[PDB]
Amino acid sequence: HMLEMIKSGKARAHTNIALIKYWGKKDEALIIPMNNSISVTLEKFYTETKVTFNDQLTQDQFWLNGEKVSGKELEKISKYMDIVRNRAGIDWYAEIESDNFVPTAAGLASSASAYAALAAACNQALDMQLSDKDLSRLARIGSGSASRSIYGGFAEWEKGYSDETSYAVPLESNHFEDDLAMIFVVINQHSKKVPSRYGMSLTRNTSRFYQYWLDHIDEDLAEAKAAIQDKDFKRLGEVIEENGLRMHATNLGSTPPFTYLVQESYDVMALVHECREAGYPCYFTMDAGPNVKILVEKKNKQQIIDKLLTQFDNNQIIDSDIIATGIEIIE
Amino acid sequence: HMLEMIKSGKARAHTNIALIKYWGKKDEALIIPMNNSISVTLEKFYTETKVTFNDQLTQDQFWLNGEKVSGKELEKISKYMDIVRNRAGIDWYAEIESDNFVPTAAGLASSASAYAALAAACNQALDMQLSDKDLSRLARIGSGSASRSIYGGFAEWEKGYSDETSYAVPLESNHFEDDLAMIFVVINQHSKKVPSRYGMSLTRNTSRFYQYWLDHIDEDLAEAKAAIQDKDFKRLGEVIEENGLRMHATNLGSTPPFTYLVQESYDVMALVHECREAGYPCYFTMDAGPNVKILVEKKNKQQIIDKLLTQFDNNQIIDSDIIATGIEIIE
C-alpha cells in the first residue's frame, strides 16, 4: 500500500538577508563562495515545503503555490533532487509541494528559503538525520544563500574550500536580534534585471573593481562580527551599508557594466540618510535587484516607516522582525 | 564718441571632453582640482562670445543665443566679470553676446567653451596680452573644464595649488588627434540631474569610495599620457574607460549616494562592448549626466554609428572630430 511505502517530510525555512554580502563564487558548480557572508533570518517571510518520495513515481513533480511547475524551474529542482537522492542513497522520484510566504513578484528572492525548506523536508522524509552543518551543506548546493536559512538570528556562511567545508554556522549574538527589524521598500523597475547568478559571475570574473571588494571584505567581516558581539547598532549599520554599496560599485566595473539600482533606490537611500539626521539610526542594503532594505531598531521602526510614507506608497512598504529560532519541521 | 571709448573683442572656444576625469575640488572658490585631468577638444561644438566694455553701462548685460539672460545665470557671469575687471584693472561694465553651438538641451555642457570664449574675448577687449597659461587661469576660475579649452587636441589641466599655478597645458600627441573622433549618444533621463558642482563636492567631501579614486589617479594619468605619445589607441581607450567608470563608482559611496547613469547609459556601454568584440575598437566615458561618449578611430566611426542605430534613434547620435588648433580670436 502507498501509505506503507512513501517517505515524506514537511518543513518551514525563513528567508535571510545578507548584511555582509555573498558576491562571487570560487566554485560555480559546487557553490563555494569567494568570501564569508553574514545574514539575519526574517520572521515574516518563509517557504513551507513538503516532499513525498514514492517508488511508483516516474519523474519528480513540483507544485509551487498550488500551481504545477514545468520548464526550466522543474529541471532545476529535479537536478537538485538527483543530488539529494545521491546523498541519501535512494532512487525514488518525489512529489514536491511548496508554498512561498515571500512576495516574489515584489522581487524578494525565495531561493534562500526554498532550498533550505526542501533540504530539511528531505532530511525528514529519508531519515538522513543530518546535523545542522550537513543540513546547511545540502541547502548550499542548491542555493548559496539557503545555507544560512538553517539558522535563526545572525548566521555566517563559512566559505570553506570544498563541498564538505562550505556551510553556514550560527553567530553568537546574545539576543541582539530581538531589538532589531528590517523594512523593505519595494521598487518596480521597467527593465528586466540581470539574473543574480549570471550577474555575480560576470562581476567576479570580469570586473575592473572586484579587487576593491576583495581588498576590504575581511575587515568588514570582522567589524560586523565585533559590532554584533558588542550589540553596537550604529557600528553594525555603518559597515553593512558601506559593504552593500561596495558590492554594487563592483558591477560598474564588469565587462560590460550593469546596475541593480534604479533612481527610486537612491530616493530611498536619501530618506534613510534624512532619518539618521533626524535622530533615527537606520541603515540600508540592496541585493540583486532595485528594492531597498533598511535595518532599523524596533523602537524606531514606525518612525522610519512614517518618514518613508512622505515619499513612498503604503503598498511599497513591508517590514519584518528578525526570527531567533531556526528551520522548523512540521508534524 | 562711443567708438573712441569702448573696448571689445570676440572669441571662439570649443568644448573639450575629459578622458581622465576632473572629479573633486581641493579649493571650491578658486576651482583648484584634487587631481590633473586630460581632455580632447571637439571641432563640432563651440561658443562664440563678444564682450563690449562701455563706461556708461550700469550693470553687465548678457545675451545668450539672442535671448537676454536674467536671474542666477546673469549673477554668475557678473561675478566672473568682477574677477576679469579686477585682473584687468578696469571698472567698466560690459555687454556680453554669446552664441552656443552646443546642444545644451541635449545635456551637453557649455561651461568649458563659454568661459574660455569669455576669457579670450576679454583678453582681446582689454589688451591683457595674456599668455596661454594666464588665459587658461582666467578661464579656470569661471569653470574648471574651460581651462582646457584654450588648446586644441589633447590638453592637461595641471592642478597646482593656487590661482597662479592651476591652469591647463598642451599635451604633445604628434597629431594622434587627427585619427580620432567622438560619438555622443544623447539620453533623456526622467529625473532631474544632480548638478555637477554640488555633485563632485558631495562626493569629494563625503564619499566612502573617494580614496579609491585618489589611489589610482596618478597611474591613470601617466598611463593615458604614455598611450597618447605612443599613438596607442587600445591602451588609451582602456584607461579612459576604466577611469570614467571609477569616477562614477565614487558617487555610489557618497552621503547620500547618487548616480548620473540610467539604464539607457548601460545599453550604450553594452553596444560599445559588442563593437569591440566585432573588431571595432571604441571606448566609452560619461560625465556629470547620462549621455554616453565614445572615443573611436575615424576609420571606424561609421561602423560604430551603424551598430548604435540598431538600438538607438538617429536623433540621439551626434559626432565630432577632434580640432587640432586652439582658441580663436574673431578678427
- How is chain B split into domains, by residue range? 1-185, 186-331
Determine contact: A277 vs chain B, CB below 8 A.
Answer: no
Contact B247, B21 (CB under 8 A): yes
Determine contact: A263 vs chain B, CB below 8 A.
Answer: yes
Cell of B146: 574651460
Contact B239, A257 (CB under 8 A): no
Please provide the distance, in angstroms rounded to a whole number, between the alpha carbons at the two ends of chain A.
22
Classify the C-alpha dihedral B112-B115-B116-B121 as positive or negative.
positive
Q: What 3-state class would DSSP assign to B238?
A: helix
**Strand B37-53 relative to strand B7-20, pairing:** antiparallel
CB contact under 8 A, A266 and B249: no
The domains spanning B1-185 and B186-331 adopt the same CATH topology: no
The partner residues of A51 in beta bridges, in order of sequence, read A9, A96
Q: How far apart are CA B60 and CA A148, in angstroms?
A: 68
| R_g of chain A, CA atoms, integer Å | 20
CB contact under 8 A, B270 and A256: yes
Classify the C-alpha dihedral B24-B26-B30-B33 as positive or negative.
negative
Q: How far apart are CA B285 and CA A306, in angstroms?
A: 40
Q: How far apart are CA A258 and CA B264, in angstroms?
A: 11
CB contact under 8 A, A252 and B252: yes
The residue assigned the cell 547620462 is: B290
Determine contact: A198 vs chain B, CB below 8 A.
Answer: no
Long-range contacts made by residues B171-174, C-beta under 8 angstroms, separation at least 24?
B171/B38, B171/B225, B171/B228, B172/B229, B173/B228, B173/B229, B173/B231, B174/B229, B174/B231
Chains A, B: CB contacts under 8 A, how many? 63
Helix axes A196-206, A210-229, angle to 10 degrees: 110
Cell of B129: 596680452
Task: List the one residue out of B188, B191, B177, B40 whose CA is nearest residue B103.
Answer: B188
**Strand B328-329 relative to strand B282-285, pairing:** unpaired
Cell of B327: 582658441
Amino acid sitting at position B265: S
The partner residues of B94 in beta bridges, in order of sequence, read B53
Question: How many degrees, rounded to 5, is the angle at CA A248 between CA A243 and CA A249?
Answer: 90
Find the Cα–Cα–Cα–Cα dihedral A25, A27, A29, A32, rounded to 10°: -70
Task: List the one residue out of A163, A128, A118, A107 whose CA is nearest residue A291.
Answer: A107
CB contact under 8 A, B263 and A262: yes
The partner residues of B293 in beta bridges, in order of sequence, read B184, B285
The residue assigned the cell 532589531 is: A180
| CATH superfamily for domain B186-331 | GHMP kinase, C-terminal domain (3.30.70.890)
Task: List the one residue out of B172, B177, B132, B147 whose CA is nearest residue B42.
Answer: B177
Which residues are within 8 A (CB) of A16 and not within 5 positions of it... i.e. 6 or more apart?
Answer: A39, A40, A41, A42, A112, A113, A145, A148, A149, A155
Buried residues in B217-256 as b, exposed as e (16+ CB within 10 A):
beebbebbbebbeeeebeebbbbbbbbbbbbbbbbbbbeb
How far apart, in Å, are the Cα atoms of B72 and each of A74, A220, B79, B269? 62, 45, 10, 35
SS (H, E, C) A194-212: CCHHHHHHHHHHHCCCHHH
CB contact under 8 A, B269 and A257: yes
Q: How far apart are CA A274 and CA A56, in angstroms?
A: 61
Mutate to test the interface with A, among B189, B252, B273, B276 (most CBs of A within 10 A): B252
Which residues are within 8 A (CB) of B57 and not within 5 positions of it... i.e. 6 or more apart?
Answer: B92, B93, B94, B95
- Please report residues of B whose CB lies closer than 8 A to that of A269: 256-257
Q: How far apart are CA B248 and CA B260, in angstroms?
A: 8
Q: Where are the alpha helices (DSSP H) in B44-175?
A: 72-88, 111-125, 132-140
Residue of A nearest to B211 (CA): A212
Tell me the Ramachandran region of residue A160: left when phi exceeds 0, alpha when psi lies from -120 to 50, beta otherwise. left
Element (H, E) at B233: helix B233-251
Amino acid sitting at position B134: D
Task: List the one residue out of B182, B186, B117 whose CA is nearest residue B154.
Answer: B182
CA A285 to chain CA mean position, Å: 13
Task: List the one residue out of A149, A151, A169, A152 whose CA is nearest residue A160.
Answer: A169
Q: How far apart are CA A234 and CA A211, in angstroms?
A: 27
Helix axes B301-308, B263-277, angle to 10 degrees: 130
Q: What 3-state class would DSSP assign to A130?
A: coil
Q: What 3-state class would DSSP assign to A38?
A: strand
Contact B244, B17 (CB under 8 A): no
Min Cα–Cα distance to chain A from B179, Å: 26
Q: How far apart are CA A285 and CA A182, in angstroms?
A: 10
CB contact under 8 A, B266 and A248: no
Cell of B50: 563678444
CB contact under 8 A, A249 and B273: no
The residue assigned the cell 552621503 is: B255
CB contact under 8 A, B259 and A273: no
Cell of B88: 584687468
Q: What 3-state class would DSSP assign to B109?
A: coil
Min Cα–Cα distance to chain A from B76, Å: 29
Q: How far apart are CA B187 and CA B289, in angstroms?
A: 9
CA A126 to chain CA mean position, Å: 25
Q: How far apart are CA B148 and CA B38, in angstroms?
A: 8
Tell me whether residue A135 is exposed, middle or buried, using C-beta atoms within 10 angstroms of its C-beta: 0 to 12, 13 to 18, 19 or more. buried
How far apart, in Å, are the Cα atoms of B304 and each of A209, B104, B128, B268? 27, 24, 45, 11
Mutate to test the interface with A, among B245, B254, B260 (most CBs of A within 10 A): B245
> Domain A1-185, CATH 3.30.230.10 — does that match?
yes
Q: How far apart are CA B326 and CA B135, in angstroms?
A: 12
Candidate from B246, B253, B269 with C-beta closest to A245: B253
CA B310 to chain CA mean position, Å: 29
Element (H, E) at B244: helix B233-251
Contact A152, A323 (CB under 8 A): yes
Which residues are within 8 A (CB) of B241 and not within 5 positions of it... i.e. 6 or more apart?
Answer: B283, B284, B285
Determine contact: B256 vs chain A, CB below 8 A.
Answer: yes
- Please report residues of B whose CB lies closer than 8 A to that of A266: 256-259
Q: Where are the alpha helices (DSSP H) in chain A?
A: 2-5, 72-88, 111-125, 132-140, 196-206, 210-229, 233-251, 263-277, 301-309
Determine contact: B259 vs chain A, CB below 8 A.
Answer: yes
Cell of A287: 541585493
Q: What 3-state class would DSSP assign to B13?
A: strand
Q: How far apart are CA A87 and CA A89, in angstroms?
A: 6
CB contact under 8 A, A273 and B255: yes
How far apart, in Å, are the Cα atoms of A188 and each of A15, A214, A260, A310? 21, 31, 12, 18
The partner residues of A331 in beta bridges, in order of sequence, read none
Q: Which of residues 145-184 of A touch B (CB under 8 A)?
A: none
Task: List the one residue out of B245, B211, B265, B205 whose CA is nearest residue A250.
Answer: B245
- Please report residues of A whose CB lies closer than 8 A to that of B283: none
How far apart, in Å, are the Cα atoms of A274 and each of A271, A278, B209? 5, 6, 21
- Please report residues of A whose CB lies closer than 8 A to that of B248: 252
Amino acid sitting at position B59: Q
Q: What 3-state class would DSSP assign to A43?
A: strand
Q: Which of residues 81-120 of B touch A (CB under 8 A)?
A: none
Candidate from B248, B255, B272 with C-beta closest to A252: B248
CB contact under 8 A, B253 and A258: no
Contact A260, A286 (CB under 8 A): yes
Contact A25, A144 (CB under 8 A): yes
